[PDB]
């Protein structure tokens, strides 16, 4: 199915033969089920979960009630996962990191680090025009953005300057290294999106 | 096969057929005489 | 026209039924069903079957003459049961049947397990020969055509899967 977990930086695991494998330390606390959606009411089968612990004043009543419907404590944020027909869960159940004990690889989804207003050099890997040889006020500019009279217009999806990052991105089929049950951790090989403290939706690899 | 615009019966065993709109000249003796179109 | 004007004989122990246009012929080998074309009109007249072209429709004789020649084969199928004799030519080529799955080894890196749709009875008198039987000419012919299509005759040594009746043109090296 999948679990929600905060990103807690990166380390490396030295294997006894020698190889130092770079790992991202994902803390994955008891992900507790707030709601179970089904075909009769909703038209699809899914589960809504929660994690962490939000201060009671910060949780509003429309969500304070929503948690009382289930019986669980008010976790910070809510996320949904689609069920793969066979499995079925109940409201108030606590899903832990032990689900990834069996799996080998995982897709990790997160929110990428915000680079703000980025230019075409950084954003789209555009080439910087000649830094000298007569160049006038146009080193890092995009150059042309179209043709002439024929279109007489710029085409849609033209690669231009704009907001870069702060977008949800997915890294697929990262190899799981260690699944720590006692500290509630999930060590995955490589790097996953977002900064330390950003939330990560970790789930089993669709590309098997 | 050939896709010439003027297919014709080359040898004796050549046979004209209209498959899916297109005229074809299928042959038993020589596969060289197999030809489409026209 | 000419085929259409030649009644199909129906031997004893061959239950024929005409559900409007949907024909059902049951026999000893297998029960066969044929959804026939709307332009054809078919009836029972004495022992034999009759196939008439419908008035109003453009191409009748062509459609009916087909029904005739189909049901002719359909009656022979349920009575006798058709067979096809395939042979595998070339060293290292092997054919062995386990149940309803033909294990073809045809010089590949993986032994090819061909499945048999419908009532098709597969046999092997020798290790390099496949004799398969059944009710329909259609399914037999197709199965045979796939079993062939895995390795067609090489026009040099005649290597591959061949029909027994088929002649193959080989040529010299140049």
């Amino acid at each position: 199915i999948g679990l929600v977990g905060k990103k807690v930086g990166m380390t490396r695991i030295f294997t006894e033969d020698g190889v130092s494998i770079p790992v991202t330390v994902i803390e994955v606390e008891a992900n507790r089920v707030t709601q179970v959606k089904d075909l009769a009411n909703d038209g699809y089968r899914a589960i809504q979960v929660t994690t962490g612990a939000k201060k009671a004043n910060r949780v509003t009543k429309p969500e304070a009630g929503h948690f009382a419907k289930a019986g669980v404590e008010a976790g910070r944020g809510l996320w949904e996962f689609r069920l793969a027909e066979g499995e079925e869960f109940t409201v108030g159940q606590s899903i832990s990191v032990e689900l990834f004990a069996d799996v080998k690889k995982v897709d990790v989804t997160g929110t990428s680090k915000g680079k703000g207003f980025a230019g075409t050099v950084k954003r789209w890997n555009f080439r910087t025009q000649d830094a000298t040889h007569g160049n006038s006020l146009s080193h890092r500019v995009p150059g042309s953005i179209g043709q002439n009279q024929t279109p007489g217009k710029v085409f849609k999806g033209k690669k231009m300057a704009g907001q870069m990052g702060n977008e949800r991105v997915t890294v697929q089929s990262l190899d799981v290294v260690r699944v720590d049950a006692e500290r509630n951790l999930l060590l995955v090989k490589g790097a996953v999106p977002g900064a330390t403290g950003s939330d990560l939706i970790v789930k089993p690899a669709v590309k098997a | 096969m050939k896709v010439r615009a003027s297919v014709k019966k080359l040898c004796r065993n050549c046979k004209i057929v209209k498959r899916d709109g297109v005229i074809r000249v299928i042959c038993s003796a020589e596969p060289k005489h197999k030809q489409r179109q026209g | 026209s000419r085929v259409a004007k030649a009644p199909v004989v129906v031997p004893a122990g061959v239950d024929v039924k005409i559900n409007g246009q949907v024909i059902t012929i049951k026999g000893k080998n297998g029960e066969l069903t044929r959804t026939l074309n709307d332009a054809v009109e078919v009836k029972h007249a004495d022992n034999t079957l009759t196939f008439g072209p419908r008035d109003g429709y453009a191409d009748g004789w062509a459609q009916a003459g087909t029904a005739r020649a189909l049901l002719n084969s359909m009656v022979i199928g349920v009575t006798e049961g058709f067979t096809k004799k395939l042979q595998l030519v070339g060293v290292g080529y092997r054919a062995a049947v386990k149940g309803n799955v033909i294990n073809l080894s045809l010089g590949f890196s993986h032994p090819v397990d061909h499945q048999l749709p419908a009532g098709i009875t597969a046999e092997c008198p020798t290790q390099t020969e496949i004799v398969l039987k059944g009710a329909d000419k259609q399914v037999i012919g197709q199965v045979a055509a796939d079993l062939r299509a895995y390795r067609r005759p090489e026009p040099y040594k005649g290597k591959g899967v061949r029909y027994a009746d088929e002649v193959v043109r080989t040529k010299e090296a140049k």
Binding site: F155, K156, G157, K158 | - | -
Partner: protein, 141 residues
């Protein structure tokens, strides 16, 4: 002497059902578009939406002559750099059977606010069941 024009407030709109099973697409779509517009009514006014509400159930079972089941194509652009998407009459029914009658009627209705207003009147459906039992939609042929 100031001839009659149908005043919206006074327009008494009616509900209908049409089973499109085995019907010719265009010949259905036409007779729909004539009704939706309110041509059949003797108080027809071109600037007022006088026509009737229609429910077209069993849209997927609509019939077409010749080889148009495969040959008839429905093109549309995505508004993108080189994005021209086509879908044949089969492929269209495989994904979205409502779109077939929709597009066949929309082309036959006028183009503009009232034309879009008289499209809304139409209610296409893939399944035989319709949830507009509340209006007592009478049978039309």
């Amino acid at each position: 002497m100031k001839t009659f024009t149908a005043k919206p407030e006074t327009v008494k709109r009616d509900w209908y059902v049409v089973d499109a099973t085995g019907k010719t697409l265009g010949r259905l779509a036409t007779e729909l578009a004539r009704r939706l517009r309110g041509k059949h009514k003797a108080e027809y006014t071109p600037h007022v939406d006088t026509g009737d509400y229609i429910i077209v159930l069993n849209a997927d079972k609509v019939a077409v002559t010749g080889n148009k089941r495969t040959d008839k194509v429905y093109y549309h652009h995505t508004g993108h750099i080189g994005g021209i998407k086509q879908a044949t009459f089969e492929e269209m029914i495989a994904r979205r059977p409502e779109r077939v009658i929709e597009i066949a009627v929309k082309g036959m209705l006028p183009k503009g606010p009232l034309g879009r207003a008289m499209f809304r009147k139409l209610k296409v459906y893939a399944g035989n069941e319709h949830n507009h039992a509340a209006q007592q939609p009478q049978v039309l042929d």
